[PDB]
Structure 1
Amino acid sequence: LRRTGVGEWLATTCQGCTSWCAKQIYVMDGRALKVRGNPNSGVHGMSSCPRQHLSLQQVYDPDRLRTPMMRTNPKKGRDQDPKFVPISWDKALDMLADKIIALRVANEPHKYALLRGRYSHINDLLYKKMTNLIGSPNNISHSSVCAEAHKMGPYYLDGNWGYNQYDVKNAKFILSFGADPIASNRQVSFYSQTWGDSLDHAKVVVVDPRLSASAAKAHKWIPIEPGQDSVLALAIAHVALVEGVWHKPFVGDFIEGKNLFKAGKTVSVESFKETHTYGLVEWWNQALKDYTPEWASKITGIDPKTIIAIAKDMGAAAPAVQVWTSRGAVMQARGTYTSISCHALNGLFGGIDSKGGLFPGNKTPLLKEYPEAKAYMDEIAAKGVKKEKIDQRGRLEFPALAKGKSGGGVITANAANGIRNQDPYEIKVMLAYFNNFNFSNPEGQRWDEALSKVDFMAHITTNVSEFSWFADVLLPSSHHMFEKWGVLDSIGNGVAQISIQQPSIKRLWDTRIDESEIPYMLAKKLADKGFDAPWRYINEQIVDPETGKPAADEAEFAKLMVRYLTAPLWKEDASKYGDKLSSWDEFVQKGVWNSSPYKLEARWGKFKTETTKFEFYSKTLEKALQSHADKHKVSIDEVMKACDYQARGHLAFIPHYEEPYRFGDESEFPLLLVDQKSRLNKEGRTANSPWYYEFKDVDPGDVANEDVAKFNPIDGKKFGLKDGDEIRITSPVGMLTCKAKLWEGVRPGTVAKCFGQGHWAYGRYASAKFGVTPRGGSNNDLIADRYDRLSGASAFYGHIRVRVEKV
């Protein structure tokens, strides 16, 4: 009669962070009881971070929506109770469909916007195709409030507009500018699995204004002043050249063998023969020759002997050297050149695409888009998609140079400003999913204002979050991890994997899957009302890869969307890229497809840069800036000035020191905010889980069941603070209240506080009084709306000055 072990394990994927780990769910008596890493995973195996267990308080969250709703208070605002009442799916989508069709009749489909927060790889239909067919260019992702500045170095130096995996198992030196990979970043499960072991063969240095978990388990913690990371990166490169310890097999060497790099002195470009890099000597002559350890120590306070020793240790470890950048180092108004300066070291020491270094995700045959929709665009749609985007990307002061294109990248946080100012125009109809921009974007009160000015908005969400407060209609989502068909990927351990999301329980409430069932039902409703292009596109183009037939109903369509994109993994023989799977059923049962190991040096000699080299002098960035300048009939120097960078001339294209942007009077606001994530944050989605609070002190220095801001005792004494005091923290743009904690792991002159609390909605555990009073304090109310304009990224670090007081 014993029951231990008699349940079933079913494969899915976690999305508590962009690690996107493959999981198994243990189900008994129809309930999900356990989560573990999927042993079939080649990236991480059964290894997991702690947040996997919090998933069970999300699907079984007692504040989830069980029905569509409409607001009945016609006023919108933080001060206005929406007075939601229940309606049917048919009525909710009827209301949305009517508003969309009215835009098309009025020849203003560009006044529709689709907002995307989290997502899976089946998102193309809801995000792009539905939006363009309606006739709008305003499919707005969250990428620029995430980490687009972190892609600038990799793209403009080695052609990778994307992330890297870090070969920790083979590393001999690990240098982290703000990354804390045993707590956050993009494979917490795998880097936690390996971090302790790696300390036995790698020297590890963590540069962070706070003592992170990773820094506590490192050979050196460098408590950098916020925004000064590039000073250390540049001085390390300088010493490497003076000492002659760049990685010659990758970079090259002087023609006559003798090292001619002497501090402060220019060198003939023609005396050096580069192999797989471009621009080393120009970089030296234009800037790096004067970035001495003494220069760096004066700015940072770091011992120059420590800088020199690090550079020499990296030289001896090459090419098994890897340099990490986090959001904290690069999501700053001038942060593009921190990504470039730190990532340049991965080329200088040969770690890029090398054993022990870092490299991109492996190739897989997963499809990422549904078929082209060109035949389904009518004249109304063709005209609308050409309009300027609501986030103003591509204007002189917003180059947002994703993948080398002026206006190529989203500017998520600025969409609130375009909407608020009706510039370029008014947004009249909005559909949003899996997002909470009032809470997650800097100075989110701007989204309060913007959303209050939108005639009709519908939010696809599990919970009534802060963003939902401003909705006309709520469309409750089936939970991504337990009630949904989806597909994701992950990279690490030298491989890329593709994993399934599948329902593991009977659907709890009257919800629908955001990315499949809802666009399908909406397309059907639009067709009933005379606009059938989305419906025709769906049932003629998204058909089963085996039978060629369209879906018979909602539930079938949810699975079909995954079958369509994954067919190359299980319908074909994918052996050339990794695993050979025999059937769709085997894919579902195992839950994951694994690639072959990464082929080291694969990209050497064929980077997707202008020169095909690893560019210390980025001709790739020069070409992109030239394009933007020519578009606006100005010089590149005038672009730099308009975007508030210090660089002029050749400095715009090389690693160089930008003084960090700061906002506010330092005498009034004497502390620099050090925003951090909680290691129990599933992005902005675990504040309504009681277990989160019970264990909140696993964040070093923090306090269970509380929201604390951490001060060094020096500053606590200065401002008369004691542990447990209720405090108000104020910046030039806003304030929050929380409690005080004194902790020596905080750099004096800074205050380290986790993002994630401060909800005033979401649920009964996340808020003090639902809809009225927050629990804890909302970090982004402190953070002025600022941008790394070359990337479009929002700034969350470095520029935030605050003051503190009791009560």
Structure 2
Amino acid sequence: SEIMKYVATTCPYCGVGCTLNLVVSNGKVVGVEPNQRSPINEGKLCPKGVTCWEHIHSPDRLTTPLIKKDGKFIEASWDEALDLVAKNLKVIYDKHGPKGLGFQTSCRTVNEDCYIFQKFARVGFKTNNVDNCARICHGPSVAGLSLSFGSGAATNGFEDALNADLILIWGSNAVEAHPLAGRRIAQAKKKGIQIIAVDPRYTMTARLADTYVRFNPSTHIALANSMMYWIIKEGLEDKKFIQDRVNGFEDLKKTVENYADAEAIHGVPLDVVKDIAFRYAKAKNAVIIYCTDNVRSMGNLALLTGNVGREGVGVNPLRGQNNVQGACDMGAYPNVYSGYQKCEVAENRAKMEKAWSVTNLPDWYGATLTEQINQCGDEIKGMYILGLNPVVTYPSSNHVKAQLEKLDFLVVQDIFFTETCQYADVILPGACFAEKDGTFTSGERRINRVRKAVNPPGQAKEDIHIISELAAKMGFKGFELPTAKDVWDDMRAVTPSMFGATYEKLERPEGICWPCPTEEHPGTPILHREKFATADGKGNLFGIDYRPP
């Protein structure tokens, strides 16, 4: 057939979204090659990207559906397994309404599968009990940055920090995780850019920094409060910015004026505090790289120094999962439909109803991952898990196992036989990133294409196909979407932003950044261009008091 064919794809291992070539010989992925054309990484990959191809053709991959029949799983046909799932979901619905079910997907999955998953969870039985890894993962920082600015995403890109004078890494292992985001720090120091690292431990990304600052762990609020106190005290705040685009300054004033001497809390001497504070406030264009109160303090700093809406500046919280941003965008949260359209507002609730040809959408705040797992027997019973391994990921794994065994009809879709699989009643095999054909979304809001290299191992299918077949079994209208392009077009019709991100535009190696409202718009690589995304269009900066644990 084919000998050494190159297929361009996105790396599935973190939020940088590096591009790579998979080498496919006789329908087998046999290696990973650089793609020098990519703007994100210029053909450069970390160890994970270099060896992403190893797990694709493992013998352990699930090949056919499995059904727990009075013990060890026996081999089932697709029709059999799907009819079983449809029957059990139907009965649990008809007995316990929409509260009885529970959905959660992984951030490993492509945008089209996250969107169709949340569409399945809402168009059919109307439940907002949909969620994903981002809860239990490191950062609920999206909510905090949303409160500060309006969009919880990173304000600027990665190439953007090359334009600053004062990259300020803060508590980030940006070279251990996101190494090709830390490549920007390496390039910047080669260009001679002031770099200040502030992690509690001397990490390999703190080696690159001109100044390194220890502080006692769990004291970010105290340290940032001190820095803002000195900025206010010597008046290096940005008056036009604060008076024009920011609100809450008096509250910040009261809250911070109690942090003149905080050496007791954080270990940093007042001399070093003044040094970093004045370097940051004096830098004309300074970018913060972060990795709830902790992220709102960063928003406080950026708003206080007027470092937001411009090239070479901003706040860039690093995500960590390959498609966590994409899942949140597609609307795999309890409270947002898609593109962060809140379900609390009847306006877009009715817009969803009209677009999806369904009625009486829930509008109540769903149950997050831990909410579901804790109430996994009390009112929730019946659970579809799209790619999670909760027994290995959640803390108190034994409690997780107890709750899952308290559960009626778990369904698990995975590419491998995990530990959570033993507790499933049905196991639907899935496809990995080399067999899907969707899109990922980087941490810098960039939509990248994933391309099909090989076929799923045996009888395994990809998630859009599985969910469409299940919805056709259960009699649900609106899941007639045979391709990732059709799923994407349905999503685009639904969402106001991302309406310009057609696949003919995503076939560009550059990709598209998420606020792309029209088809001629080139994208929005820098957010909050001259107005924010809150009610008055003005960022709010809050006063946080440090709580000792």
- TM-score, normalised by the number of residues in structure 2: 0.82
Q: Which residues in structure 2 correspond to 1:547-696 (within 5 Å)?
A: 551=482, 557=483, 560-562=486-488, 584=504, 593-594=511-512, 596=522, 602-604=528-530, 606-617=531-542, 654-659=543-548, 661=549
The 1-side partners of 2:35 and 2:384 are apart by 34
1:9-41 Cα deviation digits (max 9, x unpaired)? 112222212333333212223322332454443
Corresponding residue number in structure 2 for 1:788: none
The 2-side partners of 1:487 and 1:565 are apart by 13
Corresponding residue number in structure 2 for 1:80: none
Asked if 1:195 is matched to 2:185, the reply is yes
> Are residues 288 and 577 of structure 1, via their aligned partners in 2, closer, same or farther at CA, if it must alter by over 3 Å?
same
Corresponding residue number in structure 2 for 1:639: none
The 1-side partners of 2:458 and 2:141 are apart by 39
The question of whether the paired residues in 2 share the 8 Å contact of 1:36 and 1:52 is answered with: no
1:67-115 Cα deviation digits (max 9, x unpaired)? 21122455xxxxxxxx222212221111111101212443534312221
Corresponding residue number in structure 1 for 2:299: 343
CA RMSD of aligned residues (A): 3.3
Asked if 1:102 is matched to 2:88, the reply is no
Corresponding residue number in structure 1 for 2:198: 207
Asked if 1:428 is matched to 2:381, the reply is yes
> Are residues 376 and 160 of structure 1, via their aligned partners in 2, closer, same or farther at CA, if it must alter by over 3 Å?
closer
The 2-side partners of 1:17 and 1:444 are apart by 25
- Residue segments in structure 1 that go unaligned for 5+ positions in a row: 75-82, 252-273, 327-335, 392-410, 527-531, 543-550, 552-556, 569-573, 618-653, 662-807
The question of whether the paired residues in 2 share the 8 Å contact of 1:49 and 1:192 is answered with: no
Corresponding residue number in structure 2 for 1:241: 232
> Are residues 499 and 147 of structure 1, via their aligned partners in 2, closer, same or farther at CA, if it must alter by over 3 Å?
same
- Residue segments in structure 2 that go unaligned for 5+ positions in a row: 318-325, 331-337, 340-350, 514-521
Deviation of 1:491 after TM superposition, in Å, equals 5.5
Say which of 11, 30, 54 aligns to 1:14: 11
Tell me, what secondary structure is at the counterpart of 2:298? helix
Say which of 281, 284, 287 aligns to 2:255: 287
The question of whether the paired residues in 2 share the 8 Å contact of 1:438 and 1:467 is answered with: yes
The 2-side partners of 1:601 and 1:565 are apart by 22
The question of whether the paired residues in 1 share the 8 Å contact of 2:414 and 2:428 is answered with: yes
> Are residues 325 and 599 of structure 1, via their aligned partners in 2, closer, same or farther at CA, if it must alter by over 3 Å?
closer
Corresponding residue number in structure 1 for 2:308: 352
> Are residues 577 and 39 of structure 1, via their aligned partners in 2, closer, same or farther at CA, if it must alter by over 3 Å?
farther
The question of whether the paired residues in 2 share the 8 Å contact of 1:113 and 1:131 is answered with: no
Letter in 1 for 2:246: T
> Are residues 165 and 54 of structure 1, via their aligned partners in 2, closer, same or farther at CA, if it must alter by over 3 Å?
farther
Tell me, what secondary structure is at the counterpart of 1:275? helix
Letter in 1 for 2:62: L
> Are residues 566 and 38 of structure 1, via their aligned partners in 2, closer, same or farther at CA, if it must alter by over 3 Å?
farther
Tell me, what secondary structure is at the counterpart of 1:237? helix
Corresponding residue number in structure 1 for 2:275: 309
The 1-side partners of 2:306 and 2:65 are apart by 55
Say which of 233, 244, 251 aligns to 1:275: 244
Tell me, what secondary structure is at the counterpart of 1:213? coil
Asked if 1:465 is matched to 2:418, the reply is yes
Letter in 2 for 1:465: T
The question of whether the paired residues in 2 share the 8 Å contact of 1:152 and 1:340 is answered with: no
1:457-492 Cα deviation digits (max 9, x unpaired)? 11110112222221111111011x111121123365
> Are residues 308 and 130 of structure 1, via their aligned partners in 2, closer, same or farther at CA, if it must alter by over 3 Å?
closer
Asked if 1:172 is matched to 2:165, the reply is yes
The 2-side partners of 1:436 and 1:413 are apart by 14
> Are residues 597 and 506 of structure 1, via their aligned partners in 2, closer, same or farther at CA, if it must alter by over 3 Å?
closer
Letter in 2 for 1:181: A
The 1-side partners of 2:427 and 2:70 are apart by 14
Q: Which residues in structure 2 correspond to 1:95-174 (within 5 Å)?
A: 95-106=84-95, 108-118=97-107, 119-122=109-112, 123-166=114-157, 167-174=160-167
Corresponding residue number in structure 2 for 1:678: none
The 1-side partners of 2:375 and 2:441 are apart by 33
Structure number with the bigger relative contact order (C-alpha 8 A, sep ≥ 6) is 2
Asked if 1:322 is matched to 2:311, the reply is no
The question of whether the paired residues in 1 share the 8 Å contact of 2:106 and 2:133 is answered with: yes
1:587-614 Cα deviation digits (max 9, x unpaired)? 55x566346475868533x222244323
The question of whether the paired residues in 1 share the 8 Å contact of 2:288 and 2:315 is answered with: no
Tell me, what secondary structure is at the counterpart of 1:151? helix
The 1-side partners of 2:87 and 2:245 are apart by 58
Corresponding residue number in structure 2 for 1:525: 473
The 2-side partners of 1:282 and 1:298 are apart by 24
Tell me, what secondary structure is at the counterpart of 1:165? coil
> Are residues 202 and 375 of structure 1, via their aligned partners in 2, closer, same or farther at CA, if it must alter by over 3 Å?
closer
The question of whether the paired residues in 1 share the 8 Å contact of 2:298 and 2:315 is answered with: no
> Are residues 592 and 134 of structure 1, via their aligned partners in 2, closer, same or farther at CA, if it must alter by over 3 Å?
farther
The 1-side partners of 2:192 and 2:263 are apart by 29
The 2-side partners of 1:45 and 1:221 are apart by 29
Tell me, what secondary structure is at the counterpart of 1:323? strand
Tell me, what secondary structure is at the counterpart of 1:290? coil
Bigger radius of gyration among the two: 1
The 1-side partners of 2:80 and 2:525 are apart by 54
Tell me, what secondary structure is at the counterpart of 1:525? helix
1:312-346 Cα deviation digits (max 9, x unpaired)? 1112213x1122322xxxxxxxxx22222222111
> Are residues 211 and 525 of structure 1, via their aligned partners in 2, closer, same or farther at CA, if it must alter by over 3 Å?
same
Deviation of 1:500 after TM superposition, in Å, equals 1.7
Q: Which residues in structure 2 correspond to 1:255-266 (within 5 Å)?
A: none
Deviation of 1:505 after TM superposition, in Å, equals 1.5
> Are residues 100 and 387 of structure 1, via their aligned partners in 2, closer, same or farther at CA, if it must alter by over 3 Å?
farther
Asked if 1:47 is matched to 2:12, the reply is no
